Amino acid sequence: MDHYLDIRLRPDPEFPPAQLMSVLFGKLHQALVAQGGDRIGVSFPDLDESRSRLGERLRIHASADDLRALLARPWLEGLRDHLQFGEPAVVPHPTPYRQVSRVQAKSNPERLRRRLMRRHDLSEEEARKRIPDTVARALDLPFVTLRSQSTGQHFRLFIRHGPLQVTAEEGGFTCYGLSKGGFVPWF
RNA sequence: CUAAGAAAUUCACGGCGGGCUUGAUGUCCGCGUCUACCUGAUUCACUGCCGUAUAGGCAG
């Protein structure tokens, strides 16, 4: 994956950039479940780790045929007025390589309590005795908010840009474009 | 380095007895409250799955 395509959120008087970034990420995810495979990687070039902000840019990492297919496919319908685009081009080098991975946290003690009750046949009080409320961990990481279509929930999807490395390795990506082993050029 | 420097108010106690406040009364005419707006700031940290696990991961 030596090719990239930058997408920057146009400023909108109607919307904040986080809402636009989340609906763009959901539509990219739906485009990848429509496409299939594990070869599509994402990034956030104007990231702010300190303020936990994604920035205002998103960058896809793939081959050029994937970029020209995704630049005209109807997952960009209704956002071309919200979005300005670049051109499908080759990445610069030398670049450090890092991973973009979805991090999940045990954020609700009661759901894991109900799982322990389902898998150990305990009552509610044994689940509260075995699992306290200190267990709940909150991440200090930026996030998109996503509407599931299988189930009906709205959940925060916390992303982590991994450590910078001098070389990249093989692997795939999930249907959200996040690394389950793959690496992306970071520039 | 202070109108500086010091100090035991305290023992006891029956306030109760009794009573007619009454009659009478017109509130009342009148009234232009308009004008214009993003409740959305990621604001639903959720639901489940693997794992003996609370340790750690995974899905949408």
XYZ file of N, CA and C (backbone and C1' of nucleotides) in Angstrom, chain B:
419
model
O 7.203 47.746 71.727
C 6.444 46.696 71.153
C 6.488 45.471 72.018
C 6.258 45.718 73.493
O 4.895 45.865 73.832
C 8.144 44.341 73.224
P 4.482 46.910 74.970
O 2.935 47.143 74.731
C 2.492 48.228 73.932
C 1.293 47.861 73.098
C 0.005 47.590 73.864
O -1.094 48.045 73.094
C 0.581 45.697 72.588
P -1.942 49.324 73.547
O -1.942 49.283 75.125
C -2.598 50.321 75.833
C -2.610 50.087 77.313
C -3.901 49.495 77.837
O -3.638 48.849 79.077
C -3.679 51.690 78.636
P -3.548 47.254 79.159
O -2.033 46.933 78.812
C -1.694 46.349 77.570
C -0.377 45.629 77.647
C -0.293 44.506 78.662
O -0.792 43.291 78.139
C 1.620 45.898 78.815
P -1.790 42.381 79.001
O -0.877 41.829 80.170
C 0.086 40.820 79.933
C 0.930 40.639 81.154
C 0.165 40.244 82.402
O -0.043 38.848 82.500
C 1.532 42.098 82.876
P -1.498 38.222 82.247
O -2.099 38.025 83.703
C -1.562 37.064 84.598
C -2.294 37.105 85.910
C -3.803 37.012 85.784
O -4.235 35.664 85.819
C -3.221 38.903 87.092
P -5.634 35.220 85.180
O -6.666 35.463 86.352
C -6.620 34.672 87.528
C -7.507 35.241 88.599
C -9.000 35.023 88.391
O -9.643 34.854 89.648
C -8.535 37.333 88.458
P -10.004 33.383 90.169
O -11.560 33.236 89.895
C -12.054 33.066 88.573
C -13.466 32.538 88.544
C -14.529 33.450 89.147
O -15.736 33.345 88.392
C -14.521 31.378 90.276
P -16.072 34.419 87.244
O -16.944 35.529 87.972
C -18.362 35.445 88.002
C -18.841 34.788 89.266
C -20.053 33.893 89.112
O -19.935 32.844 90.055
C -20.538 35.581 90.663
P -19.932 31.321 89.576
O -20.890 30.623 90.630
C -20.550 30.644 92.007
C -21.740 30.390 92.890
C -23.055 30.138 92.166
O -23.817 29.196 92.910
C -23.294 31.967 93.620
P -24.805 28.179 92.167
O -25.768 27.693 93.325
C -25.238 27.103 94.496
C -26.053 27.470 95.705
C -27.538 27.640 95.481
O -28.219 26.409 95.427
C -26.710 29.357 96.891
P -29.276 26.128 94.262
O -30.647 26.608 94.891
C -31.254 25.865 95.927
C -32.292 26.678 96.642
C -33.480 27.114 95.813
O -34.464 26.104 95.747
C -32.653 28.937 97.080
P -35.448 26.004 94.491
O -36.498 27.155 94.756
C -37.372 27.090 95.873
C -38.255 28.308 95.979
C -39.260 28.473 94.849
O -40.459 29.051 95.356
C -37.863 30.367 94.945
P -41.636 28.131 95.940
O -42.789 28.210 94.847
C -42.582 27.723 93.527
C -43.726 28.035 92.596
C -43.990 29.511 92.331
O -44.428 29.673 90.983
C -45.919 28.514 93.231
P -43.397 30.131 89.843
O -44.297 30.672 88.658
C -44.508 32.063 88.484
C -45.715 32.490 89.260
C -47.065 32.086 88.676
O -47.843 31.459 89.682
C -47.071 34.350 89.315
P -48.574 30.072 89.365
O -50.102 30.432 89.509
C -51.069 29.806 88.687
C -52.457 30.107 89.180
C -53.440 30.547 88.099
O -54.740 29.985 88.282
C -53.235 32.229 89.766
P -55.127 29.174 89.605
O -56.136 30.163 90.308
C -57.013 30.841 89.424
C -57.852 31.834 90.156
C -58.840 32.570 89.297
O -60.009 31.822 89.132
C -57.668 34.092 90.633
P -60.400 31.252 87.692
O -61.370 32.368 87.121
C -62.492 32.779 87.876
C -63.034 34.095 87.398
C -63.100 34.283 85.900
O -64.273 33.700 85.364
C -62.176 36.208 86.921
P -64.411 33.387 83.803
O -64.852 34.776 83.186
C -66.131 35.321 83.474
C -66.201 36.787 83.132
C -66.393 37.106 81.655
O -67.110 38.329 81.534
C -64.403 38.070 82.393
P -68.464 38.384 80.679
O -67.945 38.370 79.173
C -68.000 37.166 78.384
C -68.344 37.487 76.948
C -67.819 38.821 76.417
O -67.281 38.667 75.107
C -70.164 38.709 76.127
P -65.775 38.160 74.916
O -65.071 39.392 74.193
C -65.480 39.811 72.877
C -66.354 41.040 72.970
C -67.142 41.382 71.714
O -68.396 40.712 71.733
C -66.060 43.327 72.548
P -68.755 39.639 70.601
O -70.097 40.198 69.979
C -70.062 41.152 68.934
C -70.829 42.389 69.300
C -71.350 43.208 68.144
O -72.618 42.752 67.742
C -70.324 44.609 69.764
P -72.789 41.674 66.580
O -74.068 42.209 65.831
C -73.915 43.194 64.838
C -74.538 44.512 65.214
C -74.580 45.533 64.092
O -75.676 45.366 63.213
C -73.658 46.527 66.016
P -75.537 44.406 61.936
O -75.867 45.339 60.705
C -76.637 46.507 60.868
C -76.041 47.650 60.101
C -75.195 47.296 58.900
O -75.976 47.000 57.760
C -74.143 48.984 60.175
P -75.363 46.159 56.543
O -74.521 47.221 55.728
C -75.149 48.317 55.082
C -74.139 49.300 54.546
C -73.419 48.851 53.286
O -73.135 49.981 52.469
C -71.844 49.229 54.987
P -73.982 50.242 51.135
O -73.084 49.662 49.962
C -72.979 48.262 49.743
C -72.387 47.929 48.403
C -70.954 48.395 48.171
O -70.258 47.416 47.404
C -72.372 49.314 46.526
P -69.308 46.349 48.129
O -67.896 47.067 48.228
C -66.891 46.870 47.246
C -66.947 47.957 46.212
C -66.868 47.479 44.770
O -67.780 48.221 43.981
C -65.232 49.118 45.158
P -68.744 47.467 42.952
O -68.970 48.558 41.814
C -68.515 49.912 41.997
C -68.082 50.499 40.675
C -67.496 49.510 39.672
O -67.832 49.935 38.359
C -65.890 51.159 40.168
P -68.210 48.864 37.233
O -68.462 49.757 35.957
C -67.441 49.895 34.993
C -67.212 51.328 34.606
C -66.092 51.552 33.614
O -66.490 51.323 32.284
C -65.922 53.096 35.392
P -66.205 49.912 31.593
O -65.120 50.245 30.486
C -64.961 51.562 29.998
C -63.520 51.855 29.676
C -62.659 50.657 29.357
O -62.801 50.276 28.006
C -61.526 52.087 30.866
P -62.427 48.798 27.532
O -60.878 48.890 27.225
C -60.378 49.829 26.284
C -58.901 50.074 26.463
C -58.012 48.900 26.087
O -56.799 49.396 25.536
C -57.619 49.481 28.325
P -56.645 49.585 23.952
O -55.840 48.301 23.481
C -56.493 47.047 23.359
C -55.575 45.964 22.875
C -54.289 45.763 23.659
O -53.990 44.375 23.675
C -53.781 46.199 21.401
P -53.948 43.570 25.050
O -52.795 42.506 24.823
C -51.678 42.474 25.685
C -50.483 43.094 25.030
C -49.776 42.255 23.980
O -50.406 42.400 22.726
C -48.212 43.401 25.377
P -50.428 41.215 21.657
O -48.918 40.736 21.588
C -48.291 40.482 20.345
C -47.486 41.659 19.867
C -46.228 41.320 19.104
O -46.512 41.037 17.752
C -45.824 43.098 20.629
P -45.967 39.697 17.081
O -44.482 40.077 16.664
C -44.205 41.289 15.982
C -42.745 41.629 16.059
C -41.816 40.436 16.063
O -41.574 39.947 14.764
C -41.177 41.960 17.758
P -42.045 38.470 14.369
O -40.666 37.718 14.111
C -39.488 38.467 13.761
C -38.246 37.743 14.222
C -38.419 36.271 14.582
O -38.265 35.539 13.373
C -37.171 37.375 16.270
P -38.412 33.940 13.333
O -36.891 33.446 13.394
C -36.425 32.423 14.317
C -35.001 32.697 14.780
C -34.262 31.526 15.429
O -32.828 31.618 15.446
C -34.823 33.113 17.085
P -31.965 30.859 14.333
O -32.331 29.328 14.577
C -31.967 28.665 15.802
C -32.196 27.178 15.678
C -31.921 26.364 16.937
O -32.815 25.261 17.030
C -30.444 25.684 15.222
P -34.033 25.308 18.066
O -33.667 24.173 19.114
C -33.155 24.493 20.401
C -31.793 23.888 20.587
C -31.727 22.375 20.380
O -30.551 22.048 19.655
C -30.798 22.942 22.464
P -30.660 21.495 18.157
O -29.150 21.201 17.780
C -28.212 22.265 17.756
C -26.939 21.948 18.502
C -26.190 20.687 18.071
O -24.806 20.963 18.218
C -26.550 20.615 20.365
P -23.735 20.321 17.222
O -22.450 20.116 18.141
C -22.584 19.599 19.457
C -21.680 20.306 20.433
C -20.743 19.406 21.224
O -19.583 19.026 20.511
C -21.838 20.855 22.709
P -18.969 17.564 20.743
O -19.185 16.824 19.352
C -20.482 16.422 18.930
C -20.581 14.922 18.811
C -21.020 14.203 20.084
O -21.840 13.076 19.764
C -18.873 13.434 19.434
P -23.427 13.115 20.040
O -23.659 12.126 21.268
C -22.988 12.316 22.508
C -23.951 12.460 23.658
C -25.123 13.398 23.408
O -26.245 12.948 24.157
C -23.795 14.251 25.172
P -27.117 11.708 23.634
O -26.382 10.446 24.272
C -26.823 9.878 25.520
C -26.176 8.531 25.743
C -24.810 8.338 25.093
O -23.995 7.475 25.881
C -26.337 6.795 24.171
P -22.844 8.088 26.807
O -21.840 6.869 27.006
C -21.713 5.858 26.012
C -20.699 4.802 26.385
C -20.786 4.256 27.811
O -20.496 2.859 27.781
C -18.623 5.113 27.424
P -20.946 1.890 28.983
O -22.246 1.154 28.447
C -23.511 1.789 28.490
C -24.342 1.355 27.320
C -24.395 -0.145 27.109
O -25.355 -0.780 27.929
C -23.866 0.907 25.067
P -25.032 -2.212 28.577
O -25.285 -3.228 27.382
C -26.553 -3.293 26.750
C -26.483 -4.054 25.453
C -25.796 -5.404 25.516
O -26.586 -6.427 26.089
C -25.002 -4.225 23.641
P -25.976 -7.317 27.281
O -24.901 -8.243 26.556
C -25.295 -9.441 25.907
C -24.506 -9.692 24.646
C -23.349 -10.666 24.749
O -23.772 -12.018 24.753
C -22.708 -8.787 23.461
P -22.949 -13.123 25.579
O -21.677 -13.424 24.670
C -21.830 -13.892 23.339
C -20.530 -13.838 22.581
C -19.358 -14.538 23.234
O -19.398 -15.941 23.060
C -18.663 -12.436 22.407
P -18.807 -16.912 24.191
O -17.229 -16.786 24.013
C -16.613 -17.220 22.811
C -15.118 -17.038 22.847
C -14.411 -17.556 24.083
O -14.222 -18.959 24.069
C -13.569 -15.421 23.520
P -14.456 -19.818 25.405
O -13.325 -19.310 26.404
C -11.950 -19.555 26.148
C -11.073 -18.694 27.023
C -11.354 -18.774 28.513
O -10.772 -19.911 29.124
C -11.206 -16.511 27.877
P -11.715 -21.042 29.766
O -12.494 -20.270 30.921
C -13.381 -20.954 31.793
C -13.330 -20.368 33.179
C -13.197 -18.855 33.246
O -14.426 -18.170 33.071
C -11.633 -19.838 34.712
P -14.473 -16.807 32.220
O -13.645 -15.761 33.098
C -14.157 -15.274 34.330
C -13.083 -14.627 35.173
C -12.433 -13.377 34.596
O -13.201 -12.213 34.832
C -10.755 -14.848 35.354
P -13.104 -10.940 33.857
O -13.667 -9.754 34.756
C -13.182 -8.426 34.609
C -12.496 -7.944 35.862
C -11.001 -8.240 35.935
O -10.350 -7.191 36.647
C -12.089 -9.271 37.748
P -9.228 -6.301 35.919
O -8.278 -7.380 35.237
C -7.258 -8.012 35.988
C -6.183 -8.576 35.099
C -6.160 -8.089 33.660
O -5.606 -6.797 33.494
C -5.881 -10.423 33.698
P -6.238 -5.791 32.410
O -6.105 -6.561 31.018
C -4.860 -6.624 30.336
C -4.838 -7.711 29.288
C -5.477 -7.372 27.954
O -4.612 -6.619 27.124
C -6.188 -9.520 28.654
P -5.196 -5.778 25.887
O -5.332 -6.853 24.723
C -6.238 -6.641 23.658
C -6.810 -7.939 23.154
C -7.953 -7.810 22.167
O -7.506 -7.530 20.855
C -8.504 -9.425 23.798
P -8.212 -6.375 19.995
O -9.507 -7.089 19.403
C -9.409 -8.342 18.744
C -10.762 -8.984 18.584
C -11.850 -8.091 18.020
O -11.772 -7.936 16.617
C -12.694 -9.293 19.873
P -12.285 -6.574 15.937
O -13.856 -6.784 15.790
C -14.382 -7.887 15.068
C -15.844 -8.081 15.369
C -16.748 -6.916 15.015
O -17.141 -6.982 13.659
C -17.281 -7.761 17.179
P -17.399 -5.652 12.805
O -18.741 -5.059 13.415
C -19.975 -5.739 13.227
C -21.116 -5.008 13.880
C -21.348 -3.586 13.366
O -22.742 -3.343 13.216
C -21.046 -3.557 15.717
